[PDB]
Amino acid sequence: ARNIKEVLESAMDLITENQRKGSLEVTGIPTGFVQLDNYTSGFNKGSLVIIGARPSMGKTSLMMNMVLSALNDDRGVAVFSLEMSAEQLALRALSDLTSINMHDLESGRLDDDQWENLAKCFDHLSQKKLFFYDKSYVRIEQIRLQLRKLKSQHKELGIAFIDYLQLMSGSKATKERHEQIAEISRELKTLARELEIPIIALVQLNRSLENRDDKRPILSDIKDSGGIEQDADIVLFLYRGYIYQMRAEDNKIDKLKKEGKIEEAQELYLKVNEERRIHKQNGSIEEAEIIVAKNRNGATGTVYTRFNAPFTRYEDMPIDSHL
Amino acid sequence: ARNIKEVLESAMDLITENQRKGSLEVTGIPTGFVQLDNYTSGFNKGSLVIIGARPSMGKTSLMMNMVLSALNDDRGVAVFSLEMSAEQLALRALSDLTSINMHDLESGRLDDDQWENLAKCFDHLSQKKLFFYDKSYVRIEQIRLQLRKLKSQHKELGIAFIDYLQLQIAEISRELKTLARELEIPIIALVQLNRSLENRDDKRPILSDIKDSGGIEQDADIVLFLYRGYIYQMRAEDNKIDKLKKEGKIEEAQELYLKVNEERRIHKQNGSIEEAEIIVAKNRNGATGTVYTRFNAPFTRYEDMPI
């Protein structure tokens, strides 16, 4: 009755409709952030993700949040710490799990509710398939070697984190002769594809970036003599505008006291220091930004999030819930 | 009894503490935004505030909201429209006042309750001291002469709003500052940023964007930028889909398109609420920074946050 063209166009409509229906689906490992999952569709196999940040942006803690999200999914996750002991990284994780302050937790001075809670999270985390490497300044050949070995040993391995890659600039760069970022990320991308896992690499951004008026990192900031990095599928930048506002305030006051305007410099100091009292009183919770600066085959943008400073924690929440 | 030395000392402390509270207070006209009030201590007598924004940033609606806030205080507001009718500005104020959508408002499709609610606001606005200027013609010095008579006319005048100055901007801004100081009232001068900036990697406005050939603005005490990331996100989303299409990456473009449309659907069915930025790009005796604002797209309205 109905001919093959009417049927086919209709069958095409069927799969297009399924496609539509399944388009916001998270195909990869959950990020821990729903908005971030919406952009990236999670951390996918063969993907190289770079997270770039200046110091003070809480990059290591954000990573451990993502590590936890990966563990919940029942994936085995590997974590490479170039400049930090695995212990410190575990502590950051236990802190997220127990909501116990990093300062209180590390001091070991805890109340009984806290120990009980800590003890339960300890046993929980202990059952998870998490592999730390905290030998300092390992080269990518070495990193690559360990993952190959790790992957063959554990089929469940599904993601690796690296914290962090430093950017060399100037005399240091010339004298130091480190592997360059564009080459590194080039080999990491090859490794991701080879092992068929996502690789997330933290990169500590250069200070020079801050000469700029707008101190939000840019894609070109991930570079050194040797070129701008080009091989990551996704690039996230961590930006705490509150840290830079705080420094802008301190700087302006000083400026003002210098040049002999005690009248205003004192007024600004008075105003600024009252903004900070209320801030710390309200829990030291600020508005931060996770910038999706690059997303191969995807949308680009900024996810606005709440940064809980005392827990060094970016808030996961939907755009609607935020607001 | 009580110690005489210890009372004079307490006296000095109370006076000093009162002094500390005097500073640390708004003093000037309430912006309508707690956060923005803090950065600028309200719109102050003798100051020139430039509010810069590109189109599709809802600047004029933001102004009317501001006008609305300034007006609530006994203060009389002078508003200048250089491309719009005063009415148009009033409808906007009314929509805000009655929580009635603008398009529904101007079309006139209101239920008995809507009309009833609007009528009261109509009456309410009539009582207010807002003074309107609807001259298409714009002269730096024409506004100057016109401003003076009104000030003489009403001692209740609080501020003057200019909307808007296209891109003698360094000169125009200059003349406004001397005028603002003389007048004893703050002048808020909306300005339209150049399309040229769009080209920059980072879309959010810069003080340089204020610059006009032979003219770089200095005289403004304060510069505010309006920024909606969501608008530029939508444009980039469209471009990316188009790029992918052009690269022959048909399925990737298809996926992104479907994904993007679903998100926009959810966005609309959640009220089309977006997070936006009012950027404090220039402050004198004050720190620079940014204010993260909600933005009610349907009612074109900036709103406070949860701090």
XYZ file of C-alpha atoms in Angstrom:
630
model
C 0.000 0.000 0.000
C 2.546 2.519 1.173
C 5.643 2.388 -1.001
C 9.334 1.931 -0.038
C 10.058 5.704 -0.085
C 7.222 6.494 2.323
C 8.460 3.708 4.648
C 12.154 4.678 4.411
C 11.632 8.382 5.074
C 9.543 7.266 8.060
C 12.208 4.829 9.263
C 14.727 7.632 8.911
C 12.441 9.802 11.057
C 12.415 7.009 13.628
C 16.176 6.908 14.139
C 16.518 10.692 13.941
C 13.933 10.824 16.701
C 15.848 8.265 18.760
C 18.963 10.313 18.054
C 17.241 13.449 19.341
C 15.978 11.508 22.341
C 19.449 10.200 23.200
C 21.395 13.384 22.463
C 21.864 14.673 26.015
C 22.904 11.207 27.127
C 26.230 10.854 28.919
C 28.216 8.336 26.882
C 31.420 8.596 28.890
C 32.448 8.615 32.532
C 30.454 11.159 34.567
C 32.339 14.363 35.326
C 30.743 14.966 38.711
C 29.251 18.103 37.175
C 25.915 17.871 35.360
C 26.545 20.991 33.264
C 29.996 19.643 32.379
C 28.408 16.321 31.393
C 26.011 18.264 29.190
C 28.902 19.883 27.300
C 31.308 16.959 27.055
C 28.966 13.995 27.400
C 31.403 12.747 30.023
C 34.993 11.615 29.708
C 35.127 9.347 26.661
C 37.500 6.635 25.429
C 40.544 7.923 23.540
C 39.843 11.471 24.669
C 42.557 13.823 25.914
C 41.236 16.431 28.306
C 43.292 19.319 29.582
C 42.340 21.260 32.684
C 44.340 24.470 32.854
C 44.649 26.612 35.957
C 46.850 29.107 37.733
C 47.676 28.242 41.348
C 44.927 29.088 43.892
C 42.150 27.781 41.637
C 41.885 24.469 43.497
C 42.822 22.335 40.493
C 44.036 19.366 42.562
C 40.831 19.258 44.602
C 38.652 19.518 41.513
C 40.598 16.576 40.085
C 39.944 14.467 43.187
C 36.241 15.252 42.866
C 36.358 13.912 39.328
C 38.362 10.924 40.551
C 35.581 10.170 43.034
C 32.889 10.515 40.359
C 34.824 7.998 38.275
C 35.101 5.563 41.194
C 31.346 5.742 41.833
C 30.833 4.578 38.258
C 32.816 1.499 39.300
C 35.677 2.323 36.937
C 39.288 1.770 37.918
C 41.061 5.117 37.879
C 44.783 5.863 37.815
C 46.188 9.064 39.291
C 49.640 10.466 38.548
C 50.906 13.037 41.018
C 54.115 14.703 39.871
C 54.464 17.153 42.770
C 52.438 15.664 45.640
C 52.236 12.517 47.753
C 49.375 10.064 47.227
C 48.594 10.539 50.921
C 47.757 14.208 50.392
C 45.535 13.224 47.484
C 43.744 10.562 49.523
C 43.178 13.088 52.292
C 41.576 15.504 49.849
C 39.299 12.656 48.731
C 38.371 11.625 52.290
C 37.609 15.296 52.974
C 35.139 15.426 50.091
C 33.505 12.199 51.221
C 33.162 13.110 54.885
C 32.642 16.831 54.450
C 35.341 17.170 57.102
C 37.545 20.223 56.800
C 40.933 19.636 55.239
C 42.438 21.508 58.210
C 40.567 19.493 60.845
C 41.052 16.180 59.031
C 44.799 16.527 58.567
C 45.243 17.676 62.181
C 43.668 14.399 63.247
C 41.792 16.377 65.877
C 38.287 15.073 65.172
C 35.107 14.610 67.210
C 33.342 11.237 67.427
C 30.794 11.994 64.708
C 33.725 12.914 62.488
C 35.780 9.783 63.225
C 32.776 7.526 62.783
C 32.026 9.184 59.465
C 35.705 9.186 58.485
C 36.012 5.502 59.384
C 33.068 4.538 57.200
C 34.404 6.505 54.202
C 37.832 4.965 54.762
C 36.442 1.441 54.347
C 34.365 2.572 51.361
C 37.264 4.200 49.525
C 39.458 1.206 50.355
C 37.246 -1.083 48.286
C 37.543 1.164 45.235
C 39.946 0.457 42.366
C 42.193 3.504 42.614
C 45.868 3.505 41.608
C 48.219 6.276 42.699
C 51.628 7.128 41.277
C 53.445 9.810 43.261
C 57.000 9.522 41.952
C 57.937 13.093 41.150
C 58.524 14.559 37.697
C 57.963 11.323 35.790
C 58.414 11.762 32.026
C 55.675 10.767 29.608
C 57.544 7.668 28.475
C 57.525 6.559 32.101
C 53.867 7.541 32.534
C 53.013 5.706 29.320
C 54.907 2.651 30.544
C 53.025 2.442 33.836
C 49.610 2.762 32.178
C 50.351 0.060 29.621
C 51.460 -2.162 32.501
C 48.481 -1.101 34.616
C 45.990 -1.596 31.783
C 47.230 -5.118 31.088
C 47.075 -5.916 34.805
C 43.603 -4.420 35.258
C 41.071 -4.561 32.438
C 38.767 -2.390 34.575
C 41.067 0.638 34.255
C 38.974 3.256 32.507
C 40.572 6.652 33.117
C 43.834 8.327 34.154
C 44.536 11.692 35.754
C 47.805 13.608 35.662
C 48.595 16.347 38.154
C 50.197 18.358 36.925
C 52.151 19.504 33.879
C 54.170 22.694 34.372
C 54.702 25.268 31.612
C 58.286 26.399 31.059
C 58.892 30.027 30.123
C 62.078 32.059 29.736
C 65.590 31.293 30.956
C 64.233 28.442 33.040
C 62.691 26.912 29.919
C 66.007 27.267 28.062
C 68.138 26.008 30.958
C 65.627 23.371 32.093
C 65.005 21.651 28.750
C 61.709 20.050 29.832
C 59.437 18.174 27.461
C 57.194 20.768 25.826
C 53.384 20.937 26.294
C 52.443 20.510 22.603
C 54.585 17.381 22.359
C 53.435 16.017 25.701
C 49.757 16.403 24.890
C 50.463 14.939 21.456
C 51.799 11.748 23.036
C 49.069 11.674 25.707
C 46.447 11.841 22.977
C 48.144 8.891 21.295
C 48.165 7.028 24.628
C 44.491 7.701 25.297
C 43.629 6.324 21.851
C 45.952 3.361 22.399
C 44.582 2.378 25.828
C 41.052 3.424 24.855
C 40.530 5.451 28.030
C 40.098 9.167 28.731
C 43.230 10.894 29.952
C 42.706 14.052 32.011
C 45.823 16.218 32.392
C 46.067 19.196 34.726
C 48.298 21.965 33.470
C 49.537 24.733 35.720
C 49.334 27.956 33.720
C 52.106 30.548 33.442
C 52.177 33.789 35.439
C 52.674 35.955 32.361
C 49.024 35.221 31.710
C 48.342 37.710 34.501
C 49.885 40.743 32.801
C 46.572 40.742 30.964
C 43.592 42.858 32.013
C 41.218 39.910 31.744
C 42.864 37.056 33.631
C 40.602 34.274 32.386
C 42.975 31.782 30.714
C 42.807 31.379 26.941
C 43.553 28.481 24.646
C 46.848 30.037 23.540
C 47.962 30.209 27.185
C 48.704 26.495 27.029
C 52.055 26.835 25.287
C 55.798 27.226 25.540
C 58.567 27.692 23.004
C 57.635 24.588 21.077
C 54.173 25.862 20.298
C 50.587 26.042 21.467
C 49.092 22.706 22.516
C 46.713 21.368 19.846
C 45.963 17.700 20.554
C 43.522 17.808 23.484
C 39.899 17.200 22.508
C 38.618 19.207 25.454
C 40.129 22.106 27.370
C 38.701 23.314 30.668
C 39.945 26.417 32.478
C 39.457 27.022 36.195
C 38.754 30.641 37.086
C 38.060 32.148 40.509
C 37.246 35.781 39.831
C 37.089 36.391 43.564
C 40.784 35.681 43.998
C 41.625 38.351 41.418
C 39.114 40.861 42.784
C 40.662 40.404 46.230
C 44.097 41.128 44.771
C 42.746 44.098 42.787
C 41.368 45.577 45.989
C 44.569 45.147 47.982
C 46.479 46.690 45.091
C 44.200 49.714 44.729
C 44.337 50.531 48.436
C 48.137 50.486 48.380
C 48.128 52.534 45.215
C 45.858 55.040 46.980
C 47.847 55.229 50.245
C 50.840 55.826 48.014
C 50.164 59.007 45.977
C 48.848 60.418 49.234
C 45.102 59.779 49.287
C 44.778 58.500 52.871
C 41.152 59.678 52.871
C 39.967 57.210 50.240
C 42.502 54.429 50.677
C 41.298 54.140 54.262
C 37.687 54.264 53.082
C 38.333 51.505 50.534
C 40.208 49.419 53.110
C 37.268 49.886 55.457
C 34.746 48.857 52.803
C 36.802 45.950 51.476
C 37.505 44.491 54.919
C 33.788 44.525 55.728
C 32.976 42.707 52.495
C 35.411 40.049 53.691
C 33.997 39.718 57.220
C 30.508 39.055 55.900
C 31.938 36.739 53.260
C 33.730 34.552 55.798
C 30.617 34.692 57.963
C 28.417 33.464 55.111
C 30.742 30.483 54.681
C 33.291 31.930 52.262
C 31.239 30.773 49.293
C 32.017 32.452 45.983
C 30.989 32.384 42.329
C 33.613 30.626 40.220
C 33.877 29.601 36.585
C 34.642 26.367 34.794
C 35.282 27.426 31.210
C 34.836 24.914 28.402
C 37.363 26.582 26.101
C 37.607 23.728 23.643
C 35.232 20.863 22.966
C 35.856 18.887 19.800
C 32.547 18.158 18.053
C 30.833 19.999 20.889
C 29.591 23.310 22.196
C 31.888 25.805 23.876
C 31.025 27.857 26.944
C 31.278 28.698 30.614
C 29.658 26.839 33.468
C 29.133 29.136 36.421
C 29.541 27.336 39.710
C 29.764 28.025 43.420
C 33.218 27.588 44.910
C 33.142 26.555 48.560
C 36.521 27.970 49.605
C 36.818 26.239 53.031
C 36.310 22.897 51.303
C 38.155 23.910 48.122
C 35.133 22.592 46.234
C 33.312 23.544 43.021
C 29.546 23.136 43.415
C 27.818 20.739 41.038
C 24.267 21.896 40.236
C 22.014 22.406 37.192
C 21.768 25.874 35.610
C 18.189 26.065 36.870
C 19.081 24.978 40.418
C 21.928 27.477 40.309
C 20.077 30.826 39.995
C 29.555 56.253 89.729
C 31.068 56.316 86.243
C 34.568 57.347 85.195
C 34.913 60.742 83.487
C 38.036 59.713 81.587
C 36.331 56.441 80.579
C 33.226 58.292 79.183
C 35.116 60.743 76.978
C 37.048 57.751 75.640
C 33.792 55.861 75.003
C 32.496 59.015 73.391
C 35.409 59.073 70.956
C 34.838 55.363 70.226
C 31.140 55.811 69.434
C 31.919 58.824 67.253
C 34.707 56.903 65.484
C 32.478 53.830 65.079
C 29.707 56.035 63.691
C 32.373 57.463 61.391
C 33.237 53.909 60.334
C 29.567 53.183 59.642
C 29.034 56.446 57.754
C 31.729 55.324 55.402
C 30.736 51.750 54.578
C 27.273 53.050 53.723
C 25.590 53.550 50.350
C 25.202 57.342 50.679
C 24.215 57.685 47.021
C 21.141 56.450 45.176
C 20.452 52.684 45.398
C 21.388 50.969 42.140
C 18.784 48.279 42.707
C 21.512 45.696 43.162
C 23.059 45.070 46.585
C 26.333 43.958 45.008
C 26.493 46.950 42.663
C 25.564 49.280 45.511
C 28.622 48.026 47.372
C 31.075 48.493 44.517
C 29.960 52.056 43.813
C 28.224 53.144 47.025
C 25.172 53.946 44.918
C 24.895 56.578 42.200
C 26.422 59.644 43.829
C 26.005 63.402 43.564
C 28.543 64.654 41.038
C 29.465 61.329 39.434
C 29.351 60.099 35.835
C 28.413 56.446 35.389
C 28.878 54.924 31.951
C 26.869 51.773 31.406
C 28.273 50.122 28.296
C 26.754 47.228 26.386
C 26.236 45.761 22.941
C 22.745 45.164 21.540
C 20.769 42.185 22.876
C 22.068 43.004 26.352
C 18.857 44.516 27.712
C 20.600 47.737 28.716
C 17.510 49.945 28.301
C 15.446 47.618 30.489
C 18.237 47.646 33.068
C 18.122 51.444 32.986
C 14.369 51.580 33.532
C 14.731 49.206 36.474
C 17.418 51.529 37.803
C 15.227 54.541 37.097
C 12.458 52.722 38.969
C 14.681 52.175 42.019
C 16.051 55.733 42.139
C 12.546 57.007 41.788
C 11.149 55.164 44.852
C 13.248 57.411 47.078
C 11.637 60.872 46.967
C 14.189 61.510 44.221
C 12.978 62.824 40.881
C 14.513 61.086 37.895
C 15.369 62.663 34.530
C 15.503 60.140 31.691
C 16.766 60.946 28.191
C 15.902 58.731 25.219
C 17.859 59.484 22.063
C 16.452 56.634 19.866
C 13.159 55.788 21.642
C 9.814 57.263 22.693
C 9.212 57.984 26.366
C 6.106 55.830 26.193
C 8.138 52.785 25.139
C 10.286 53.340 28.248
C 7.159 53.600 30.409
C 5.647 50.344 29.093
C 8.913 48.734 30.146
C 8.651 50.218 33.630
C 5.025 49.060 33.790
C 5.872 45.489 32.745
C 8.435 45.369 35.533
C 5.957 46.887 37.946
C 3.081 44.514 37.172
C 5.107 41.390 36.378
C 3.330 41.434 33.015
C 5.283 40.230 29.973
C 6.339 43.063 27.651
C 5.047 41.537 24.413
C 1.744 40.611 26.046
C 1.714 44.097 27.528
C 2.182 46.069 24.303
C -0.110 43.779 22.305
C -2.745 44.389 24.969
C -3.829 40.796 25.582
C -4.559 40.975 29.318
C -7.223 39.202 31.373
C -9.506 41.239 33.643
C -7.017 40.689 36.474
C -3.988 41.798 34.446
C -5.627 45.064 33.392
C -6.744 45.675 36.976
C -3.225 45.066 38.284
C -1.725 47.292 35.584
C -4.126 50.180 36.228
C -2.937 50.527 39.836
C 0.681 50.658 38.679
C -0.344 53.192 36.038
C -1.778 55.354 38.817
C 1.291 54.672 40.931
C 3.740 55.700 38.224
C 1.753 58.864 37.515
C 2.478 59.979 41.071
C 6.201 59.595 40.577
C 8.495 62.516 39.803
C 10.182 60.956 36.779
C 10.682 63.569 34.059
C 10.874 62.361 30.487
C 12.739 63.622 27.450
C 11.857 62.278 24.018
C 13.962 64.275 21.551
C 15.419 62.247 18.686
C 17.766 65.198 18.262
C 20.871 64.917 20.431
C 23.308 67.705 21.289
C 25.954 67.399 24.004
C 25.207 70.991 24.913
C 21.486 70.778 24.212
C 21.065 68.267 27.038
C 23.194 70.701 29.026
C 20.815 73.636 28.701
C 17.747 71.414 29.168
C 19.147 69.757 32.288
C 19.666 73.083 34.067
C 16.097 74.332 33.821
C 14.730 71.101 35.248
C 17.115 71.245 38.184
C 15.916 74.775 38.834
C 12.379 73.562 38.288
C 12.620 70.757 40.849
C 14.846 70.422 43.909
C 13.584 66.839 44.118
C 15.564 65.813 41.021
C 17.870 62.910 41.827
C 19.610 61.850 38.614
C 19.714 62.019 34.828
C 19.886 58.952 32.593
C 21.133 59.134 28.993
C 20.191 56.307 26.586
C 22.118 56.021 24.515
C 25.381 57.353 23.109
C 26.594 55.753 19.889
C 30.235 55.055 19.067
C 33.659 63.065 20.503
C 32.943 60.330 23.048
C 35.972 61.414 25.066
C 34.636 64.952 24.619
C 30.974 64.115 25.271
C 31.902 62.150 28.401
C 34.020 65.142 29.413
C 31.210 67.640 29.084
C 28.906 65.372 31.081
C 31.348 65.162 33.994
C 31.735 68.923 34.391
C 27.965 69.174 34.027
C 27.341 66.427 36.600
C 29.610 68.146 39.133
C 27.918 71.484 38.520
C 24.432 69.953 38.658
C 25.094 68.158 41.974
C 23.467 65.014 40.601
C 24.826 61.746 39.121
C 24.585 61.134 35.370
C 24.135 57.590 34.074
C 25.100 57.453 30.403
C 24.242 54.243 28.561
C 26.581 53.690 25.609
C 26.460 51.212 22.725
C 29.694 49.286 22.220
C 31.102 48.738 18.742
C 30.442 45.556 16.768
C 34.190 45.410 16.184
C 34.766 43.956 19.609
C 32.690 40.894 18.794
C 35.760 39.796 16.837
C 37.914 39.549 19.961
C 38.290 36.027 21.402
C 36.813 37.237 24.724
C 33.476 38.921 24.009
C 32.980 40.642 27.366
C 33.636 44.412 26.978
C 36.836 46.338 27.651
C 37.484 50.017 28.412
C 39.230 50.247 25.030
C 35.905 49.323 23.403
C 34.760 52.664 24.799
C 37.362 54.367 22.602
C 36.302 56.274 19.484
C 38.772 57.532 16.848
C 40.619 60.476 18.406
C 38.578 59.874 21.542
C 39.358 57.645 24.505
C 37.034 58.045 27.496
C 38.544 59.154 30.821
C 36.028 61.453 32.526
C 33.558 58.824 33.759
C 34.102 58.024 37.432
C 32.592 54.594 36.924
C 32.219 52.208 33.999
C 29.772 49.294 33.987
C 29.605 46.670 31.257
C 26.605 44.500 30.474
C 27.454 40.942 29.480
C 25.274 37.937 28.659
C 27.474 34.908 28.119
C 24.416 32.917 27.067
C 23.907 35.035 23.979
C 27.465 34.465 22.812
C 27.214 30.793 23.743
C 24.225 30.488 21.429
C 26.088 32.211 18.618
C 29.133 29.987 19.054
C 26.899 26.906 19.178
C 25.413 27.933 15.818
C 28.838 28.618 14.307
C 30.258 25.313 15.483
C 27.361 23.410 13.935
C 27.958 25.327 10.726
C 31.721 24.736 10.808
C 31.232 20.990 11.325
C 28.735 20.986 8.442
C 31.270 22.716 6.227
C 34.034 20.287 7.209
C 31.850 17.464 5.950
C 31.447 16.177 9.487
C 27.734 15.620 8.995
C 26.938 13.351 11.934
C 28.858 15.443 14.474
C 27.042 18.567 13.320
C 23.790 16.624 13.486
C 24.437 15.457 17.042
C 25.425 18.938 18.249
C 22.354 20.443 16.607
C 20.024 17.948 18.302
C 21.808 18.330 21.636
C 21.718 22.122 21.423
C 18.011 22.196 20.570
C 17.089 19.924 23.475
C 18.991 22.143 25.892
C 17.290 25.279 24.585
C 13.933 23.537 24.976
C 14.693 22.699 28.595
C 15.991 26.252 28.953
C 12.722 27.767 27.774
C 10.552 25.425 29.819
C 12.573 26.517 32.845
C 11.710 30.165 32.275
C 14.630 31.191 30.059
C 16.635 32.277 33.098
C 20.298 32.894 32.325
C 23.261 33.978 34.415
C 24.783 37.258 33.252
C 27.449 39.783 34.236
C 27.489 43.464 35.086
C 31.208 44.240 34.883
C 32.665 47.049 37.005
C 35.492 47.917 34.606
C 36.345 51.282 36.143
C 35.929 52.563 39.687
C 37.578 55.566 41.320
C 38.488 55.168 44.981
C 36.850 51.772 44.543
C 37.808 48.263 43.469
C 37.057 46.874 40.018
C 35.293 43.554 39.505
C 32.181 41.742 38.341
C 28.640 41.168 39.536
C 26.961 37.890 38.674
C 23.303 38.573 37.961
C 20.313 36.426 37.138
C 18.562 37.516 33.973
C 14.862 36.992 33.311
C 14.766 36.935 29.513
C 10.952 37.079 29.068
C 10.703 40.178 31.279
C 14.179 41.349 30.212
C 15.271 41.851 33.806
C 18.515 41.648 35.762
C 18.063 40.180 39.254
C 20.124 39.766 42.420
C 21.931 36.522 43.325
C 21.961 34.322 46.453
C 25.235 35.361 48.165
